[PDB]
Design a protein around this ligand. Structure first.
Ligand SMILES: [C-]#[N+]C1CCCCC1
Ligand SMILES: [Fe+3]
Ligand SMILES: [Mg+2]
Ligand SMILES: [Mg+2]
Ligand SMILES: [Mg+2]
Ligand SMILES: [Mg+2]
Lengths: 197, 212
């Protein structure tokens, strides 16, 4: 009849899993709490934004980021779980890059933060590979016909970040000012950095 | 595994539930949500009970309707619990006792997996490759939309990793392979029924063969 299986509340199941393992001495003191900290506070798109602003103002670093992303990210100490082999992909006047994991949620955690709910949605996972122009449009980003859209499906160990184009009107801005306009969505590739009116 | 999790290219879904730069709220929206990832790492790094690939596979092994109605983080609670049971660390009985009710798990594997391929080719940037026309019932890191399709190498990784089709089943014969960024024209994957330009899939060497 296609009905859902009977299940205890998800919180009860999740904590049961914790307690089953913890009660057997299999989870070190403060282990899950430490990970929660890392996930909430350390893994952050602010790190990716910092990398973008550096690339925008330092041609040498830009070239390193684009040829050996791992080494570039390592200079900042931002390698980590789900972010050990980094490739940065360069937007150009004729190319817009977008990242997905069609098979589950694969994301460069340490520099983009854990993926947002929408990125893990079946809608995004199904659609962006096939109709990225329409998906971005619906999300609020218009990509003209003369720009090729390239979708990177994160199917193995490469962990991606988008290096967006530096928008006009930011000439002479400090790294701090530039960082501010590089958002999580810019790093994923669904948004273009915005300059205030 | 040709499961419902292989969603790329599926038609009929509605809008992505987001507009750019909208507030996505806190990292975790419920007090339990950090547990799946944290206990996965406990399993991998502390217990050595399973691989990360085995976690992807056990989630692929959710009964299909169960997968389709289960929120993301809950799929990983189910997957990690399933692995703990399969590896003999926990019993389903004690999970259900502690949970105070039913805790259905992923379905048993119907494949033992497969070894890292014996004969592969080192490809170079710019080379034309075809994705091997193969069907793998166990874990595989090849979305079906690219099976049998032709593309161009844009990158060969400078590192190598265990073949997912083996390590995703905890086998001893995963070896190591680099992966390749393979660029496909949108029309190669979806004919006229796409609005995109290109799609780059990160494919293990063992999934590829020279074109022609
Ligand atoms: C748990 N878990 C998912 C986390 C990222 C790697 C694949 C599995
Ligand atoms: Fe994923
Ligand atoms: Mg490792
Ligand atoms: Mg300039
Ligand atoms: Mg100034
Ligand atoms: Mg399929």
């Amino acid at each position: 009849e296609n009905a859902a299986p009977a299940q205890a509340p998800v919180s009860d199941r999740a904590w049961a899993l914790f307690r089953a393992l913890d009660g057997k001495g299999l989870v070190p003191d403060g282990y899950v709490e430490g990970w929660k900290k890392t996930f909430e506070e350390d893994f952050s798109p602010r790190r990716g934004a910092e990398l973008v602003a550096r690339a925008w103002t330092d041609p040498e670093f830009r070239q390193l980021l684009l040829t050996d992303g791992t080494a570039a990210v390592a200079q900042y100490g931002y390698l980590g779980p789900q972010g050990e082999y980094i490739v940065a992909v360069e937007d150009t006047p004729t190319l817009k890059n977008v990242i997905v994991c069609s098979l589950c949620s694969c994301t460069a955690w340490p520099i983009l933060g854990l993926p947002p709910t929408w990125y893990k949605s079946f809608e995004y996972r199904a659609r962006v590979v096939r109709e990225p122009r329409k998906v971005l449009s619906e999300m609020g980003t218009e990509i003209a016909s003369d720009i090729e859209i390239r979708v990177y499906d994160t199917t193995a160990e490469t962990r991606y970040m988008v290096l967006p184009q530096r928008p006009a009107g930011t000439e002479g801005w400090s790294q701090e000012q530039l960082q501010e306009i590089v958002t999580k969505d810019c790093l994923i590739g669904v948004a273009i950095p915005q300059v205030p009116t | 595994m040709d499961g419902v999790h292989d969603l790329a290219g599926v038609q009929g879904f509605g809008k992505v539930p987001h507009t750019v730069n909208a507030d996505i709220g806190p990292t975790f929206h419920a007090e339990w949500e950090h547990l799946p990832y944290s206990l996965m790492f406990a399993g991998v790094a502390e217990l050595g009970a399973f691989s990360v690939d085995e976690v992807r596979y056990v989630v692929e092994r959710m009964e299909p309707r169960h997968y389709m109605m289960t929120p993301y983080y809950e799929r990983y609670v189910i997957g990690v619990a399933t692995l703990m049971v399969e590896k003999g660390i926990l019993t389903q009985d004690e999970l259900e006792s502690l949970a105070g009710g039913p805790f259905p798990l992923s379905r048993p594997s119907e494949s033992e997996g497969r070894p890292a391929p014996v004969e592969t080719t080192t490809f170079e940037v710019g080379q034309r490759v075809r994705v091997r026309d193969e069907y793998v019932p166990g874990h595989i890191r090849m979305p079906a939309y690219c099976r049998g399709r032709v593309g161009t190498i844009s990158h060969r990784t400078t590192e190598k990793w265990p073949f997912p089709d083996a390590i995703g089943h905890g086998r001893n014969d995963a070896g190591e392979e680099p992966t390749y960024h393979v660029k496909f024209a949108a029309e190669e994957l979806f004919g006229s029924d796409t609005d995109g330009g290109s799609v780059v899939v990160d494919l293990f060497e063992g999934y590829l063969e020279p074109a022609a």
